[PDB]
């Protein structure tokens, strides 16, 4: 039976990282958040004012508003049998940019790099390059031939038991 306090069961969640106490980076207060960005809510217990609720810790939300001191973050909360939208205003101390679209934003740039050359190759009449191939799960490896010149064999067999003591 736990209590119903605001910060119940937070001995280890709100504890600072080992050898990571005190003031934080200045990149935390210097990062530029724009509407539509992806951020991660991380309750920094060193700052007690404006501490987001512990249920939002580690959740990835989107920026929906930018205020002089706080950033409007929008997250989905699971309720009895539905999902509701929660709109928080969190200072930049308790949020962090998310890399959830890091790989996707590279693939976006890779296809746009090829598309840029395509509109130029079309003017010159040469064939235009194809878009990068889509990602696939690890495919069955094809048949390959292994040269016997630099090969060595090691027999694998069950091992005789030896008492550790």
């Amino acid at each position: 039976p736990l209590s119903n306090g605001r910060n119940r069961r937070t001995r280890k969640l709100f504890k600072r990282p080992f050898r990571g106490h005190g003031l934080s980076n200045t990149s935390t207060i210097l990062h530029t958040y724009k509407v539509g960005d992806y951020v991660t809510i991380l309750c920094n217990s060193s700052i007690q004012h404006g501490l987001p609720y512990k249920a939002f810790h580690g959740k990835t939300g989107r920026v929906w508003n930018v205020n002089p001191h706080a950033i409007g973050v929008m997250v989905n909360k699971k309720v009895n049998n539905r999902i509701v939208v929660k709109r928080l205003h969190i200072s930049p101390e308790h949020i962090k940019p998310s890399g959830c679209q890091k790989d996707f934003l590279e693939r976006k740039a890779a296809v746009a790099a090829i598309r840029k050359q395509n509109i130029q190759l079309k003017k010159e009449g040469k064939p235009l390059l194809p878009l990068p191939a889509k990602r696939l799960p690890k495919q069955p490896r094809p048949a390959e031939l292994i040269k016997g010149a630099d090969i060595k064999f090691t027999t694998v067999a069950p091992l005789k038991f030896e008492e550790l003591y």
Binding site: W64, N65, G72, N81, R82, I83, V84
Partner: protein, 60 residues
């Protein structure tokens, strides 16, 4: 006459019959609570564009 106090049994099965209802797209596009200046800037342009659209209707 003691009774069982609590159980989460069958609760996840119940919650997934009619599965987790997602919010609609219009739930993410709400504007209440936005920046005061940004709302002031947006309203000024919308008023300007609408007033310019309406004078064209009068012209034609």
């Amino acid at each position: 006459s003691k009774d069982k106090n609590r159980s989460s049994h069958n609760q996840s099965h119940k919650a997934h019959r009619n599965g987790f209802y997602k919010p609609k797209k219009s739930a993410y596009m709400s504007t209440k609570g936005m920046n005061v200046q940004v709302l002031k800037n947006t309203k000024a342009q919308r008023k300007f564009a609408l007033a310019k659209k309406l004078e064209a209707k009068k012209a034609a």
